[PDB]
């Protein structure tokens, strides 16, 4: 026969290998495909879809629909945050279980910009301005609007547009961040504050809800496929 020399790796089974193998059903007349709607070519397509953030994971709200609603009211202006969460899309509990977080938890590395949309669900008669801020990491997380306004931010007029989108641009020392809580690849902070205040006339609800959505931008990518911690099997 042809002289051959078996190298290391011979006879192993690497689950990630890509080798040919014999067909157990030769000459099978495969049913041809049809043009089903909604074909998906890349998992990032799913990550680019806005999905609702469970922003309110309090004891009484977590694992209910209330966890998706953040309550604003028409009280007097303050500089204290409405909501706060870290830019760890795979490991921050508010973001981990979003579609983006679910996809990222199958990968070790992620990079790219993010889109955070906020939808105001108060009455048409309610007016107000909010400030939505991204602070890159390395400093104290914004405790008040005075600090938050120094970072990237957007002023949202709820009276004008019920929805506001803030793009958190990719800014990182590393070319990729890990999909775990990691100090070296920490992604920064996201906060919301009252810019002026929510104002309502009489005979109007004085408390309303906003909803948060997160998605990946077109520059987003992931690497190093891995098993997720979000599913387990017992026994």
């Amino acid at each position: 026969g042809l002289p051959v020399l078996n190298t290391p790796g011979s006879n192993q089974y690497l689950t990630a290998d890509n080798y040919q193998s014999p067909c157990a059903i030769p000459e099978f007349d495969v049913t041809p495909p049809i043009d089903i709607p909604g074909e998906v070519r890349n998992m990032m397509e799913l990550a680019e879809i806005d999905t609702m953030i469970p922003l309110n994971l309090t004891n009484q709200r977590k694992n209910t629909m209330d966890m998706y609603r953040v309550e604003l009211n028409d009280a007097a202006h303050s500089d204290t945050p409405i909501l706060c969460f870290s830019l760890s899309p795979a490991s921050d509990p508010r973001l981990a279980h979003t579609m983006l977080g679910e996809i990222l938890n199958y990968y070790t590395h992620w990079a790219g910009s993010l889109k955070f949309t906020f939808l105001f669900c108060g009455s048409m008669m309610a007016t107000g301005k909010l400030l939505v801020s991204y602070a890159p990491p390395g400093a104290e997380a914004p405790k008040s609007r005075k600090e938050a306004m120094l970072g990237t931010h957007v002023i949202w007029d709820i009276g004008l547009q019920s929805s506001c989108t803030m793009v958190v641009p990719w800014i990182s020392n590393t070319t990729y961040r890990l999909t775990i809580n990691d100090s070296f690849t920490e992604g920064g902070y996201i906060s919301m504050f009252y810019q002026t205040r929510v104002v309502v006339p009489l005979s109007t609800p004085r408390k309303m809800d906003i909803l948060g959505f997160v998605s990946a931008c077109n520059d987003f990518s992931v690497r190093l496929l891995r098993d997720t911690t979000h599913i387990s099997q017992e026994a």
């Binding site: 059903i25 030769p26 000459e27 099978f28 007349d29 041809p32």
Partner: protein, 240 residues
């Protein structure tokens, strides 16, 4: 009324090649590696080559009257100890010798015939992947005959009853010889038993004169039947 349908389904897997493109077990040949004086161990086994020892391949073949194909034989060899109190054994080597009609059949596991100077022999090492050989179409006729409606002899007037008698449907058209199987190793202190499963795959198949498939259990190499003569179940005439 019917619409226009651009049909795409093909009959690729129902070609006679595809229908027979499988290895089918045609025999289980048992041999023993043991001391020659035990008198209960078969140190060699001779199996006449045929597809009629099993039923599945037989039924598929007998869908047709005549066939012409090359054959692929695959030998799967399994072995085991028969007792635990006589030590162990070294890896066995098996000789599978094809004995064409007329060649001397071995009488002992180590007689001269195993020299196999002209008989093809396959030496298989235990634990190696199943042995495999191919044979072309070797019929002395222009096709194999699955059914032969005749005799090898015609009895003649004036011959006694014993003379001129041959089995109905038996002809040398299917005399393909035998396989003689032995364990080449000299015996260990403990008896070992091995089975060689022979798998047959027709290749480059051509068939002629289709027949209704066997409907009742096979009984012998012929078309005889004795048992299971009521294959149809009961069902009402107007019961869906």
């Amino acid at each position: 009324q019917t619409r226009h349908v651009i049909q795409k389904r093909t009959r690729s897997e129902s070609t006679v090649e595809s229908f027979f493109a499988r290895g089918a077990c045609v025999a289980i040949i048992e041999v023993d590696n043991d001391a020659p004086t035990k008198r209960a161990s078969k140190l060699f086994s001779v199996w006449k080559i045929t597809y009629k020892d099993t039923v599945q391949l037989r039924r598929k073949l007998e869908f047709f009257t005549y066939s012409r194909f090359d054959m692929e034989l695959t030998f799967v060899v399994t072995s085991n100890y028969t007792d635990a109190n006589n030590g162990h054994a070294l890896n066995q080597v098996y000789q599978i010798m094809f004995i064409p009609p007329g060649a001397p059949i071995p009488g002992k596991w180590n007689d001269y015939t195993w020299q196999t100077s002209s008989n093809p022999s396959v030496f298989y090492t235990y634990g190696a992947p199943p042995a495999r050989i191919s044979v072309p179409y070797v019929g002395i006729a222009n096709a194999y005959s699955h059914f032969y409606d005749g005799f090898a002899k015609v009895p003649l007037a004036g011959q006694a009853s014993t003379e001129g008698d041959s089995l109905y449907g038996a002809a040398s058209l299917n005399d393909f010889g035998s396989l003689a199987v032995r364990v080449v190793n000299d015996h260990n202190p403990t008896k070992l038993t091995s089975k060689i499963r022979v798998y047959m795959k027709p290749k480059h198949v051509r068939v002629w004169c289709p027949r209704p498939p066997r409907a009742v259990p096979y009984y012998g190499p012929g078309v005889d039947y004795k048992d299971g003569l009521a294959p149809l179940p009961e069902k009402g005439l107007t019961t869906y």
